[PDB]
Amino acid sequence: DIMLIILTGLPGVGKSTFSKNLAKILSKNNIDVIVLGSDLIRESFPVWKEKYEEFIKKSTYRLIDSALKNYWVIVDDTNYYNSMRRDLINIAKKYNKNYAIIYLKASLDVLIRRNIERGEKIPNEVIKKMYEKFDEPGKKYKWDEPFLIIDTTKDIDFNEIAKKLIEKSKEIPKFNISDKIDKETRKIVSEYIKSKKLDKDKIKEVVELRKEFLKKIKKVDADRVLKEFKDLLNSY
Template sequence: MLVIFCGIPSIGKTLIARRLAIELEGNDGSTFVVGSDDIRHLIPAHEESFEPEREAFIREITLHLIDFLLKKGKNVISDDTNYYNAMRRDLIEIAKRNKVEYAIVYVHAPIDYALKWNKERGEPIPPEVIQRIHDRFDIPGKKYKWDQPIAYIDTSKIQLEDAVKNIHQKIRDMKSRKKVKVKSSYYNSGKSEEIDRITRSIVGKIMAESGDKSLARRVSFLRKSFVREAVEKNLSPEEVESEFIKRIKSVVNSENL
């Protein structure tokens, strides 16, 4: 699966992402934490002198690496600010192409908290960069339903271990709901096919016996709505047959009035 972290710099996303990766590793398989900072470390000169024109290329490499790992069946945590809707959408598209689940985690904190923490660490990130991202940040879920986070983590109010437990539980809950939904979908599909077969057989007999095309059209229309109703009510095959025949008789009787 792909877990998409988003939030302004210097609020503890990386600490949470790495701790969460350990939890997922033990329960859900190999998990990689991938962020653009990891790519920047591969370019020492870029670390010494920030060059904005390289950022698009670094982003491209980051996305390629995430795509590669998902193709190999690995879990990936995107440890980046991902502060635009479009950035998160790009990641979601990668997850969809690889047919894996995805989850957005919104890690947030007041701007003053981020600036203070950054200063205590010797300001590895220029304060103006943190402020600029904060000002431009697209809050996930505010505009699009597909952008809705599964967890909101305020690092100024929650401890590291509690944050990790919160996110991990949300992921488990999400997977459980999807399993139930898939199971229900398969069940309803099979049930619908059986009901469809029974009712078609009954309509076929009526057409063969009566030869009344007008009646056949009415019964055929009735059958379609009845199939949906029978699936919703979870009728047994015997109940489907008796109830559908009863409905047909009602139509026939109204025709003869």
């Protein structure tokens, strides 16, 4: 009776806080659960470099795979693209475990204010673009439909959620390069902004630069594309 819980939701929506609260209640019910997410490995490097992301991603999948043989796993990650949620569901599929996607939502104004209170580590402008561009889960594939959609500005009943997940766990389980380029150019942009401490007008400019660059890319070799993106930001 092991299940895979897949969080999804934009930066600052409260994934990690929700993960820790849910884990506490599950363990109260004598469920063995582990919270795993890419930041565990990413933040173990003293700096960020794009070449680290492959190791970060694989390491995170490996831990989840190993963990899910013996424990419930809560995947604490933005999981912005359907391709990521697919990779995770395929881990559950490998071991015939049930899974539940839990989509955490909040308005853009809430995410911005939360970002501001945590020291605006990711740029506000970047959260705004992510918000505009986000394809909400379940809008394409039936396997991607959320088990729960949770408004994190309203009271959340963790006992009820726990009850529902343990019920689900007893049920019979039923079952991109463009994404990488999109994901890493965004991270590169955020890092440059933070590194070079760009002003608000410069921030708008580089976010717009990225948008234009990606239109050109679309209308590919990832490493060449990302290297050129870096060179472009430097040039600009």
